[PDB]
């Protein structure tokens, strides 16, 4: 029942020969505009334009002052004032860098996270609210307009180990987080407490006060489970009101909090139930930090493995067996595929590998 077909049009290696962990297409650019994506790995942040006939044009290369730094994630946004594109990067050093993609010059660096940062996500509605998951067991929500730490998610009922991923729902009402503690927790940010916290962070101004901004400390999630996976949870994304998550278990599980017919906004924080709806089976992805992704309209699901194969599913198919598309393979792609990014229109698919290579796959 899957329709989708791709073509490997191009591949290149970055001369640093260090693993590429993250890849992201800038989905903020408008129609007709160039299709730009960023790659992160080592102390490097490289930008690329996608052109006709599988041409991948190198634009700029940010090389971090810190040689020890190893970037793991990157998130695209824009300046709410100027409409100027903005890119946020983070890694091992646990420092969030806000880069001007046009000058490839850092504009601000947020510190606070006690350890490494594994994920970065911009709220789907507000371009200033940056979420970061950390090795320090907590989630930090930041206002990048007023340079404030809005909230710290964690504590008494937060993750008991390194948080590995997180995802906002389409509307930006809530976050689903996951980590080495095998759990998946839900944080509602549309609570009278959170919305007020966000509002307060916008009214905060240093040239009006001597006293610093007080972050909210959210010790209690609105849902928790360890009934989904038997090892670390390395990737989590929402599929509407449903969750898609994975472990080393060679499957992406589609589940939901509570009993099969319980509405997500009606489940109580003390809910013990969970409903496993389906599995996306694949192979040779028994290692950690392998991140699956989707296209804007959430019709496609891509995942890479340790041997350079690229699994794709058609999410519009109900049974996840018949949803399977042709595994994208290339006898020259044998390194582990850390992450993939579709272009906003789905015409391009990029994969990043451990051997410092980028692989381009154009839809037919």
């Amino acid at each position: 029942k899957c329709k989708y077909s791709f073509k490997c049009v191009n591949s290149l290696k970055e001369d640093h020969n260090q693993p590429l962990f993250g890849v992201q297409f800038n989905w903020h650019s408008k129609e007709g505009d160039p299709l730009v994506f960023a790659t992160v790995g080592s102390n490097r942040v490289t930008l690329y334009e996608c052109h006709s006939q599988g041409e991948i044009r190198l634009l700029q290369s940010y090389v971090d002052a810190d040689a020890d730094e190893n970037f793991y994630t990157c998130a695209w946004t824009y300046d709410s004032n100027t409409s100027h594109p903005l890119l946020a990067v983070a890694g091992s050093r646990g420092i969030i860098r806000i880069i001007n993609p046009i000058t490839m010059q850092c504009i601000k660096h947020y510190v606070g996270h006690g350890n490494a940062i594994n994920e970065l996500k911009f709220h789907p509605r507000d371009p200033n609210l940056l979420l970061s998951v950390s090795k320090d067991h907590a989630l930090r929500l930041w206002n990048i307009q007023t340079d404030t730490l809005v909230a710290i998610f964690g504590g008494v009922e937060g993750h008991r180990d390194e948080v590995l991923s997180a995802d906002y729902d389409l509307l930006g009402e809530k976050i689903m987080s996951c980590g080495m503690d095998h759990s998946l927790k839900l944080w509602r940010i549309n609570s009278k407490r959170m919305m007020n916290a966000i509002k307060e962070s916008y009214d905060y101004n240093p040239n009006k006060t001597n006293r610093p901004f007080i972050s909210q400390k959210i010790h209690f999630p609105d849902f928790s489970t360890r009934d989904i996976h038997r090892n670390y949870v390395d990737c989590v994304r929402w599929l509407g009101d449903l969750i898609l998550s994975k472990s080393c278990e060679n499957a992406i599980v589609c589940w939901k909090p509570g009993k099969m017919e319980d509405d997500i906004d009606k489940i109580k924080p003390s809910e013990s139930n969970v409903t496993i709806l389906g599995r996306f089976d694949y192979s040779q992805c028994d290692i950690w930090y392998m991140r699956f992704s989707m296209d804007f309209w959430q019709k496609m699901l891509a995942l890479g493995n340790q041997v350079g194969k690229l699994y794709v599913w058609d999410l519009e198919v109900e049974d996840p067996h018949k949803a399977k598309c042709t595994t994208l393979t290339h006898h020259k792609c044998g390194a582990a595929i850390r992450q993939t990014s579709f272009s906003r229109d789905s015409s391009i698919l990029i994969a990043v590998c451990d051997d410092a290579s980028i692989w381009r796959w154009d839809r037919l």
Binding site: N26, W27, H28, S29, K30, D33, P34, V36, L47, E49, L59, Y78, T82, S83, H84, P85, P101, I102, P124, R125, L170, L171, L239, G240, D241, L242, M260, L277, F296, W297, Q298, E316, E318
Partner: peptide
């Protein structure tokens, strides 16, 4: 069905996000 109802939520919502994107001009890099 469960699936059909969830796919519609995806449509309605992603359209809200798309309509927000269309009403916006972001500078090329």
């Amino acid at each position: 069905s469960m699936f059909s109802s969830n796919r519609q939520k995806i449509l309605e919502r992603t359209e809200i996000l798309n309509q927000e994107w269309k009403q916006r001009r972001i500078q090329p890099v």
